[PDB]
Structures are given as structure tokens and as C-alpha cells.
Amino acid sequence: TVTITADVRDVTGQPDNQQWVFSTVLRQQDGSILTQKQVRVNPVDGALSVELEPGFAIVVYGEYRWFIEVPETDAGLWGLIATSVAVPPDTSAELLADAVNGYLDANPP
């Protein structure tokens, strides 16, 4: 995981504790399956901090929705929102790699 952060305030400078939503498409990364569970994070005194797994994620806040790519090391959430992709990347190559890697783990040399 990587820690992703923002400072969150209203127009009068007071902290705004409304929840941010994080999710992904179903995939394997390291030894683990990542699920489509929508995880809801409160900012605490206006500091938003969340540990995420690298690669594709979905960010939702109010009316807005964004497809972020989480980088390999700690980053500000607004840089990822400003660089968010239009539509999800496919898993077609990854599913072949996983199928081969699975059949190999099922019967080693």
C-alpha cells in the first residue's frame, strides 16, 4: 500500500468532514484479489489520509467520479484527480498472465 492525502476545507476556511469513496475493478495484485467494495473515508479535522493499493482505483465525491491510477509511492490526491483517465484500462493481458501463472503454481518443475 501507499498513503494518499489531501487537506480539505470549505470556502470560509473551516474543515469539511464529508466522506470520500474509494473502489476498484476486480483484479489480482501481489498474492491478493482486490474487490469492488466502496470504502468510505472521513477526513479528520479536514485531513484526508487513506492507504491504497497501487494501480487502478475509482474516486467518488458528491456528484463527481474519477478514474485514478495510484502511483508506487506517497502522493497528494489532487494530483491524481487532475491526471485521472477517461475510462478504465482493460485486464485482458493480465488475465492471460494470471491463468498461466496459476497453472504453473498448480504443478511446479
Binding site: 480539505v8 476545507r9 470549505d10 470556502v11 470560509t12 464529508q18 484526508l48 465525491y61 458528491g62 489532487w78
Partner: protein
């Protein structure tokens, strides 16, 4: 940016009825400015508030404006009349 104004009746008494301030979702100085619609009451007819530079939406009761908050302290009427 500090923004201030005195607010009154036609008889020169305080008008402490609430003003409303809001924004689009945006980043300023590395801070996320959320789209929350904040109510502010003048105190003895004085409003004093801190606003982030760039676009802000203002409402009193029926009237509304889209002000552009400058980097320096200013009177709310000069920002309203510029809309």
C-alpha cells in the same frame, strides 16, 4: 484573502440576516475547497470572513453573484459590484 462589510437596514440599524458563500470543487494553495454552501451571519451588522482567491458564489436571500476574490484584502461591495 480577508473580505469584510458593514450591512444595514434603510434605517441604519444592523441587518444580521445570513449571507451564503460557496464554490466549485477546486484546489488552492494545496487545499481542496469543497462545494459546501456555508451560511454566515453578520455580527452587529459586520461580516468578516476569509475567502480563497478565484471564483466564489455569494447569495444574500434572493440575490446571487459569482465574485472573483483577489489576492489582497477587500470590501465585499467592491467584489459584488464587479460581478
Amino acid at each position: 484573502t480577508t473580505v469584510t462589510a458593514t450591512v444595514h437596514d434603510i434605517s441604519g440599524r444592523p441587518d444580521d440576516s445570513h449571507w451564503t458563500f460557496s464554490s466549485d470543487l477546486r484546489e488552492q494553495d494545496g487545499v481542496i475547497i469543497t462545494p459546501r454552501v456555508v451560511r454566515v451571519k453578520p455580527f452587529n451588522g459586520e461580516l468578516a470572513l476569509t475567502l480563497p482567491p478565484g471564483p466564489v458564489r455569494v447569495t444574500h436571500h434572493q440575490d446571487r453573484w459569482l465574485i472573483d476574490v483577489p489576492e489582497e484584502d477587500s470590501d465585499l461591495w467592491d467584489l459584488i459590484e464587479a460581478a
